[PDB]
């Protein structure tokens, strides 16, 4: 008793910790796997791509929203998206299935969120930085973009749209 209890607990504690680690190493394993598959695309590009937020819609890819979509490989299409105070450009974004869409998103004003309901596309948008994510929607229909970072009094109201074709 008491000295019997001290020994018994530190015994089951050495095991518990060996089990927790081995269970954590499984968790490290399964993450590694998702970094190896198609699904790993939604992780932002590593490289810095600097932009001026005050020139963005005057000169450059984001100025003309009729120019936002641009095929760039065999099954590739680049969409230059623009998340501004309470709205998304272009509205709507139109895209084809089986195609790998590479988004390039930026803001002229404040930090906005970009979250495409029913997808893993969940990336922050920072003025002065292009956020580059990849995704091939398999499901077709009506995609709704949501701002999920406080950006002003009309934040709760900033919805966007991705339009995907059969």
């Amino acid at each position: 008793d008491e000295h019997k209890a001290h020994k018994a607990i530190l015994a089951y504690e050495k095991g518990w910790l060996a089990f927790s680690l081995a269970m954590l190493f499984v968790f490290i394993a399964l993450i590694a796997y998702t970094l190896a598959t198609h699904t790993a695309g939604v992780i932002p590009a590593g490289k810095l791509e600097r932009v001026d937020p005050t020139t963005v819609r005057q000169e450059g890819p984001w100025a003309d929203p009729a120019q936002a979509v641009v095929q760039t490989g065999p099954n590739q299409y680049t969409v230059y998206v623009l998340a501004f105070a309470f709205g998304y450009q272009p509205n709507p974004i139109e895209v084809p299935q089986g195609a790998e869409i590479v988004f390039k998103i930026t803001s002229p004003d404040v930090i906005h969120g970009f979250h495409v309901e029913g997808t893993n596309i969940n990336v922050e948008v920072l003025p002065g930085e292009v956020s580059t994510v990849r995704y091939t929607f398999k499901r077709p229909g009506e995609y709704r973009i949501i701002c999920n970072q406080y950006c002003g009094l009309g934040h709760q109201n900033m919805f966007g749209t991705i339009v995907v074709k059969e």
Partner: protein, 33 residues
């Protein structure tokens, strides 16, 4: 006295909680993948 049977009970509940959450969330990611 003996084996901290009750403590093993509490950490197991915690082991099941982490597994239902994590593996549960590992489902929706691929179903959104």
């Amino acid at each position: 006295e003996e084996k901290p049977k009750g403590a093993l009970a509490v950490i197991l509940v915690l082991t099941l909680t982490i597994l239902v959450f994590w593996l549960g969330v590992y489902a929706v990611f691929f179903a959104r993948g």
